[PDB]
Structure formats: C-alpha cells, structure tokens
Design a protein around this motif. Structure first.
Motif, PDB file in Angstrom:
ATOM      1  N   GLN A  40      36.323  27.418 -44.136  1.00  0.00           N
ATOM      2  CA  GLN A  40      35.528  28.270 -44.730  1.00  0.00           C
ATOM      3  C   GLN A  40      35.897  29.586 -44.950  1.00  0.00           C
ATOM      4  N   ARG A  95      41.025  10.603 -46.655  1.00  0.00           N
ATOM      5  CA  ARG A  95      39.441  10.890 -46.292  1.00  0.00           C
ATOM      6  C   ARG A  95      39.161  12.257 -45.916  1.00  0.00           C
ATOM      7  N   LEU A  96      39.956  13.200 -45.187  1.00  0.00           N
ATOM      8  CA  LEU A  96      39.938  14.394 -44.993  1.00  0.00           C
ATOM      9  C   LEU A  96      40.106  15.076 -46.033  1.00  0.00           C
ATOM     10  N   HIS A 101      37.088  15.043 -48.357  1.00  0.00           N
ATOM     11  CA  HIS A 101      35.839  15.744 -47.813  1.00  0.00           C
ATOM     12  C   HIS A 101      36.114  17.361 -48.346  1.00  0.00           C
ATOM     13  N   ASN A 155      35.077  17.605 -52.061  1.00  0.00           N
ATOM     14  CA  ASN A 155      33.846  17.637 -52.024  1.00  0.00           C
ATOM     15  C   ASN A 155      33.123  19.224 -51.479  1.00  0.00           C
ATOM     16  N   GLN A 156      33.748  19.714 -50.376  1.00  0.00           N
ATOM     17  CA  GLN A 156      33.347  20.845 -49.848  1.00  0.00           C
ATOM     18  C   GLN A 156      33.684  22.222 -50.615  1.00  0.00           C
ATOM     19  N   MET A 186      31.558  21.914 -54.042  1.00  0.00           N
ATOM     20  CA  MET A 186      29.912  21.979 -53.699  1.00  0.00           C
ATOM     21  C   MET A 186      29.705  23.784 -53.347  1.00  0.00           C
ATOM     22  N   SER A 187      30.690  24.222 -52.501  1.00  0.00           N
ATOM     23  CA  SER A 187      30.563  25.780 -52.307  1.00  0.00           C
ATOM     24  C   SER A 187      30.759  26.477 -53.602  1.00  0.00           C
ATOM     25  N   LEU A 198      36.262  11.502 -39.523  1.00  0.00           N
ATOM     26  CA  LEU A 198      37.221  11.577 -40.726  1.00  0.00           C
ATOM     27  C   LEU A 198      38.546  10.833 -39.973  1.00  0.00           C
ATOM     28  N   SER A 250      27.632  21.106 -46.117  1.00  0.00           N
ATOM     29  CA  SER A 250      27.095  21.477 -47.398  1.00  0.00           C
ATOM     30  C   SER A 250      27.077  20.374 -48.341  1.00  0.00           C
TER      31      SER A 250
END
Lengths: 143, 143, 143, 143, 143, 143
Positions: free
Chosen positions: A51, A71-72, A75, A78-79, A82-83, B85, B116
């Motif tokens: 973040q 996969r990490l 993710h 995606n994060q 989306m942010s 994950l 999110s």
C-alpha cells in the motif's frame, strides 16, 4: 515520500528492477524508486509495503516477466489496477513495462491478459525515449 | 479435522461469527466451523489457533467488521492472504464478508484496502444465496 | 496418582480453587484435583509438593487473581511454564484461568504478562462450556 | 537500559547472535545488544529475562536458525509477536532475521509459519546494507 | 513401643500438647503419643529422652507456640530435624503444627525460621481433616 | 558481617567451594565468602548456622554437583529458595552455579529440578565474565 514512479516486480527479478530504475532515472525522470526501496523488512509483509508503494507513487510501473506468472504477482496486479480505478483522478498511473531482457513472446497468459488492452510501454521500440517523455510530463499528481 | 470453512473475526464480535456460521449452515454448507472451533485454550496464543484455522480449512472467511481494524487483525489478514498465495491450488480461499451489523462505509481503510479486489460477499446484496451456492461448489479441494 | 488436572493458586485463595475444581468436575472432567490435594503437610514446602503437582498432573491450570501477584506466585508460574516447555510431548499443558471473582482488567502486570502469549480459559465467556469440552477431549496424556 | 535492538536466539547459538550483533553494529546502528546481555543469571528463567528483553528494546530481532524449532522458541516467538501487537505504539518493531548459517529452506513449519506472512530481513541478499539503513532510521521509539 | 506420632513441646505447655493429641487420635490415627508419654523422671535427662522420642516414632510433630523460643527448644528442633534428614529412609517426618492457642503472627524468628522453608499444618485451616488424612496414611514406615 | 556472597555446598565438596570463591573474588567481586566461614561444629547447629548464612549474605550461590543430591542438600535448597522468595526486597539472589567438576548432564534431578525454572550460570559458557559483571553490579542489597 511521494516518489515519482515505483517498479513492482517479482522477488527473484531484482537486477531487472535495478536496471530499469537506473535507466529511467538516466533518461531524465528524477526521484526514481523501486518496490524494494519501500519494501520495509521490519514486519511490513504485504499490507503496509504494497500500500505504501501504491499510494506514495505517482506512477505504478508494472514489470512483466516470465517469472511474473506467480499467483502473488497476479494479486499484486489486481490490487494495483483496482486501486488506480477506484482512486479519484489518476487516469493512467498503471504503466505496463516490457524490459529489454524480456520479449513479447513471454507474456504471461494468466497475468498479462489483464493488461492486454491497456497502454503499454516497451523497451524494444525505437521510440522509447519519446514515450518516456510523453508519459512523465512536467505536470503530474500532487499530495 | 479439515473443516469446510472457518470465520476469522475480532475478539469483541463473538456473536456475529456464530450468527454468520448458523446462517451459512442454513444455506446448505455442512461443517460450519468458526474461529472458536479450533481456538484451543492452552499453549496457543496465536501459534496454531491462527494457523490450524488457516491450515485445516478449505475456505477462509474474514469478517470486515468495525472491530476488525485492530492491529492484530491486520497481521491476521496478512497471514491468511500470504498463506493462501503460497499454498498451491484453490486461488480464492480468502473471502471478505460483510455482515448486516456492519456497513460498506464502515470499511476501515487500513484493513479493507488489503481486500479491495477480492471475492466479496455481502449480506446487503439480494443475490447472496446464489453467490454462496457458486462459491461453495460440491467439489472441495483435498486432504 | 496421575491426576487429570491441578490448580496452582495463591495461599489465600483456597476457596476459589475449590470452587473452580468443583465447577470443572461438574462439566464432565473426572478426577479433579487442586494444589491443596497434593500440598503435603510434612516438610515439602515447595521442593517436591510443587514438583508433585507439576509432574503428576496431565494439565496445569494457573488461577490468575489479585493475590497471584506475589514473587512466589511469579516463581510458580515460571517453574510450571519452563517444566511444561522442556518436557517431552504434551504440547499444551499450562492453562491460564480467569475466575469470576477477578476481572479481565485486573490481570497482574508482573505475572500475567508471562501468559500474555497464551489463550486463556475465561469464565466470563459465554462459550465456556464448549472451551472446557474442547480442552479436555477423551484422548489425553499417560504415564 | 532501553537498548536499540535485541537478538532472540536458541540456547546453542550464542556465537551466531554475537556475530550478527557485531555485523549490525558495524553497519552503523549504535548501542547494540543481544539476548545474552539482559539474560541475568539470578532467577529470571523466562519471566523477567525474556520480558525484560521484549520491554526494554526498540527493535526485537528473531534469529531464524536451525535450533530455533524448539517448543521454547515457538513460545518465545508467540510472546514477542503478541506483546508487540497488543501494546500501543511501536508500530512494526519485530524483525525476522536470516543469517548465513541458515538457508532459505531452513524455514521449519512450526516456528517459521508464524512469520511466513511476515516480511524478513535476509542478509543473503546484495541489498542488505541499504535495507538495514532503511530499517533503523534515526527517528525511532521514545522511552 | 514404636508409636505412630510424637508431640514435641515446651516444658511449660503440657496441656496444649495433650489437647492436640486428644483432638488428633479421634480423626483416625491410632496409638497416639506425646513427649510426656516417654519422659522418665529418674535417670534420663534431655539427650536420652529426646533421642528416644525421635527414634521410636513414625512421625514427629513439632508444636510451635510462644513458649517454644527458648534455647532448649531450638536445640530440640535442630536435633529432630537433623536426625530426620541424616537417617536413611523415612522420606519426610517432621511436621510443624500451629495450634489455635498461637497465631501466625506469633512466629518467633529463631525457632520458626528453621521450619520456614518447610510446610506446616495450621489448626486454623478449614481443610484440616483432609490434610491430616493426607499426612497419616494406612501405609507408612517401620523399623 | 554482611558478606557479599555465600556458597552453599555439600560437605564432601569443600575444595570446589573454595576454588569457586577464589575465582569469583579474582573476577572482581570483593569480600567473598563460603559456607565454611559461618559454619562451626561447636556451638551453632546445622540448621541454625544455615539460617544464619542465608540472611547474612547479599547473594546466595548454590553449587550443584553430583554430591548435592542428599535430602539435606534438598532441604538446604528449599530453605534458601523459600527464604529468598518470602522476604521483602532482594528481587532475585539464589544463583544456580555449575562448576568445572560437573556437567550439565549429571545435575541432580531431584535437587536441580527445583532450580530448573531459574537461570544458572555455567563456567562452560564463554561469556562467563560478562555474566558475572552483569550479576554482581556495584549497586546491591543493604542491611
């Protein structure tokens, strides 16, 4: 704080991230930053570090690689997307990046498909410097 | 052992976990475990009472309540997400949940920002039963 | 010999220990014991009486209270915890206990801080019976 | 008192702790310490020695070694993590550490699974010096 | 000969010792004895009668009181304790006794400090009968 | 009077106690003492002189050895520990000692199990001088 651009990357690919940040600093973008710069090892596992990389960076530069298929990494993509979409303003902060070592044939089917229809930045292109100049304009985001 | 799903929550919101467990068992998901189901009294403070919940559950559900902003709660979310994950298979084990006792505006940034872009389940939504049926398919992982 | 569980307590609070033993035996744990059960009168001040309580008990239940803050109580907690940790097998033996007489905010800072990393067996909790049943399953230690 | 950082280690790895303390002081962190410096002999088995290390230190550094898989070590990790998380202030002090003598595959499940979601400080990496300089900033905890 | 227990008391407190013995045999301990039971007027002085009391008793019961502070009383306590400790067998026999005629605040430092490390039995205790039953068991020593 | 530290030991191992006293005085602790400095066959009895040695020494050092297993030794350990714990002030003074002549495997189980909770100082450790310096600080007990 509030760096210009951040380079999200896989854990193994450290040298690629260092090379890319050094090159983008050389081309004329000051205050270069990478994920492993605010990747604060005292306990910030993936909440505060990710973040902090997302929020405190004007541009989020994703670094696609053959090792970016985990996969990490998906993710994280995606994060970041989306942010960027939920946050007010920030038109095209997320900038997919193709490093010189990588090739267009090694795009991750599962991961890079999310960025297939979005404005990409490539190193193999001979117009790379002009692309960087256009993307990193003097006017940018604020606090 | 190897419970179908486990509900992670804060210390204060004990009743909400039981209510959600009863409701989700009513919808037709057997073995409605909760955090207090494997919250063994002795020896564990957070060693396996937080790990056996992660390890011995097919699906992990995080209650995004107003009391879920605790400092320990952020570490719990980090542990659950990172264990999901790193683990192989079942990409969507971690599921945010919004009980009626909470509100979408009550989402604290520090913890909700981690989820999110995840598989969100809302009791405020009127398609809750279909979402539950879609998420809890007959085939459930392995031993 | 080889009692199922013992209660370690301050000398003043014997009645609380008796009450807790009676209540815990009522819930369905046979062969209840207390410190005054093997608190032998000849000689054994703390040399073997405490050792008889630790060695010959399947479970050890510290009775946290306001009278449990003395230095002797701190040494008792230290000895019980270290003996449990160094012992072979028996992963979880030391069970912190909060009786109804005390309050969650009345924990003695000097002594209860040792057990701050362990889950308590709270009498105030509405899930007390389930916690007791879970902590005292039929399969247990042996000689 | 109030040491800047303390190294928690196993009973058989005093030399590794001393070496890591010397190396970390060499990088430019003044007033180093290790668990065998507030490990006072008179009494204080784990009551007022481990708690003294936790309370009177700014950055708790767990030394993930091969001998760190014991039950006592797991209890120490739980105690450190829970004490850090419960107390107000000290945002993210706890730091997993990976020395040379250990390996990336040395992560025993029982102990390292607690910090699996947590981010570690690995001196195997080539960015270790800058990483440490990022960790121990001049501004830090008060009394 | 070979009485079960013997009461050691000050010269001026025969009535207290007699009352204690009378109260005690009723609980179930047969063949009670006191010092005046083996205390010959002629011939024997102090070393012979006291040694006869120590040798021919399965249990020795010191009776703490206000008159139990003289140098002779200290010598008797020391002799009884050392004879119990050195003699092979008889794991633990010396029992401090606190009658109602005395008070816990009336513990003379000199004589009582020898038995301070040992545990006693108090007539003020509410579990007196159970403690007495625990001390004197049907199985016991012989010579 | 008021010796800085005393060494309780078995009667058989007189030489070891004297050697340890000489060494510990050499390290920098002034006005050393041993059990045979306030111990006479004439006059005071064993228990009385032991009690005199307990409360006239700022620090008490139990010298564990293979000859430290007798019931008299166990009683001495019990008395010293109980006197230290009950008395006001003196937070921690009973210091388990391990000399050259013994090993951490031949410790008297029955006797050293009492001190298993506490921390011992071992001559085998390479940090012995620092342990002693941290132990006998300039500020200490007062009459």
């Amino acid at each position: 704080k509030f760096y210009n651009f951040v380079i999200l990357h896989a854990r193994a690919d450290e040298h690629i991230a260092l090379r890319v940040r050094e090159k983008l600093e050389a081309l004329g973008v000051p205050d270069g930053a990478t994920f492993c710069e605010d990747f604060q090892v005292p306990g910030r596992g993936e909440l505060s570090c990710l973040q902090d990389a997302i929020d405190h960076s004007a541009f989020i530069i994703l670094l696609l690689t053959s090792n970016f298929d985990c996969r990490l990494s998906l993710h994280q993509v995606n994060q970041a997307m989306m942010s960027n979409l939920t946050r007010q303003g920030s038109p095209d902060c997320v900038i997919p990046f193709l490093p010189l070592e990588s090739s267009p044939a090694q795009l991750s089917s599962d991961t890079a498909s999310l960025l297939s229809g979005l404005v990409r930045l490539d190193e193999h292109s001979q117009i790379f410097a002009r692309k960087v100049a256009n993307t990193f304009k003097p006017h940018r985001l604020q606090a």
